[PDB]
């Protein structure tokens, strides 16, 4: 269905999760899901080039016990299809910080109040090239 | 056994898996398992500092339907407690090539004849700092 699925991550607050991968030449959208498990996501990171009505927009949302939360759309879109990008993610009690390329970075509330991230999955027109723990 | 567990890898012949991590100060052993799943491992890579009657010896083996194969032991042991070590693994239908530090490398047969690897697992006194797909 999608890409890489990693579990047992022991991502404690402060630590950084760096993910590098190449986006398809004709990418429609790609995603990175972080959380406790697939149904309890503290972060559903979804850049949309041309999908679900959104064009060149990063849509973020959470999932709690299977129920999707309120979406949060971002304006800056530093991803050119057919290139290699790197996203860096860290969190704390209050919220997570997503560092995108070109110096852009935004925050997303930690609606789940997760003290550790043990799950991550990738999907869409994206191919993981590296996963780093810092 | 077990720690970071990654599924849906879809690693194919020619592509190499690279893992970097730091070994524990009083590490008795650590392991990396590659296979089609938890019970069918084309490679159980296990560097033992002091475990199972072995002192500083790399024990490799396979597992088919849960049955451990015939152990193959290695001479070199470029591991030191506290230090960060990197290993790279490539494969084809014949055998996997474990490339260790300074140009040293050894081969282990692809006993199960897997064409692709979808499961990776890590365990023991090892801290994964990065996993790259090349
Ligand atoms: C003809 C003859 O006698 N030949 C002997 C061999 O018998 C002997 O074989 C090895 O023996 C060791 C030690 O076993 C001891 O404990 C037994 C009971 O627990 C006992 O019955 C044994 O006799 C032996 O006892 C020792 O006996 C000696 C002499 O009697 C005592 O010493 C004497 O003591 C005196 C004072 O009392 C005095 O000091 C004398 O000077 C002194 O000599 C000693 O004190 C006494 N100790 C004890 C506790 O009783 C075995 O460990 C070893 O077995 C392993 O290897 C063989 C194959 O070589 C396997 O068949 C066996 O299953 C073991 O394999 C390991 O299996 C595990 C489990 O699967 C593997 O780990 C897993 O691996 C997976 C990956 O594949 C995965 O990683 C997983 O996570 C792991 O858990 C290991 O990798 C396996 N390792 C290997 C290599 O296969 C031998 O049987 C030898 C050497 O001792 O000498 C002669 O050749
Ligand atoms: C300028 C611009 O870029 N604006 C965009 C908006 O376009 C965009 O809105 C989206 O619009 C979609 C299309 O609607 C049209 O098509 C249907 C189907 O035929 C029509 O029935 C409907 O009437 C619309 O028709 C259009 O009408 C206009 C006006 O008549 C036509 O234009 C006119 O045309 C004439 C000539 O005839 C002339 O040229 C005029 O000048 C011109 O104006 C136009 O041509 C015509 N189009 C067609 C084809 O006929 C909607 O489908 C889309 O819907 C989403 O948003 C609404 C609320 O806004 C929701 O109610 C709806 O359910 C849906 O929500 C999305 O739900 C999905 C899941 O179901 C969400 O995705 C999930 O998200 C999760 C994370 O939270 C996970 O990631 C999961 O995997 C993922 O699947 C998704 O996020 C939801 N989207 C939103 C926004 O919440 C939408 O409204 C908006 C919003 O994207 O952005 C603007 O920038």
Swiss-Prot record, chains A, B:
InterPro entries: ConA-like_dom_sf, Galectin-like, Galectin_CRD. Keywords: Acetylation, Apoptosis, Cytoplasm, Extracellular matrix, Lectin, Phosphoprotein, Secreted. The keyword Cell membrane does not apply. One of its GO terms (biological process) is apoptotic process. The modification N6-succinyllysine is found at residue 107. The modification N6-acetyllysine is found at residues 12, 28, 107, 127. It is found in: Secreted, Extracellular space, Extracellular matrix; Cytoplasm; Secreted. Coiled coil: none annotated. Residues 3-134 form the Galectin domain. It comes from the Eukaryota. One of its GO terms (cellular component) is cytoplasm. It holds the Pfam family Gal-bind_lectin. A beta-D-galactoside binds at residues 44-48, 52, 61, 68-71. SMART domains: Gal-bind_lectin (SM00908), GLECT (SM00276). The modification N-acetylalanine is found at residue 1. GO terms for molecular function: lactose binding; laminin binding. Homodimer. Binds LGALS3BP. Interacts with CD2, CD3, CD4, CD6, CD7, CD43, ALCAM and CD45. Interacts with laminin (via poly-N-acetyllactosamine). Interacts with SUSD2. Interacts with cargo receptor TMED10; the interaction mediates the translocation from the cytoplasm into the ERGIC (endoplasmic reticulum-Golgi intermediate compartment) and thereby secretion. This is Galectin-1. It comes from Bos taurus. The gene is LGALS1.
């Amino acid at each position: 269905a999608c890409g890489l699925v990693a579990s047992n991550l022991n991502l404690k607050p402060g630590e950084c999760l760096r993910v590098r991968g190449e986006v398809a030449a004709d990418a429609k959208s790609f995603l990175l899901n972080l959380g406790k498990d697939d149904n309890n996501l503290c972060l559903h990171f979804n850049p949309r080039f041309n999908a679900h009505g959104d064009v060149n927009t990063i849509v973020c949302n959470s999932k709690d016990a299977g129920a999707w939360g309120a979406e949060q759309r971002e304006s800056a879109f530093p991803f050119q299809p057919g290139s290699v990008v790197e996203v860096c993610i860290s969190f704390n009690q209050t919220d997570l910080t997503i560092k995108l390329p070109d110096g852009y970075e935004f925050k997303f509330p930690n609606r789940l109040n997760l003290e550790a991230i043990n799950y991550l999955s990738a999907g869409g027109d994206f191919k993981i090239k590296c996963v780093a723990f810092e």
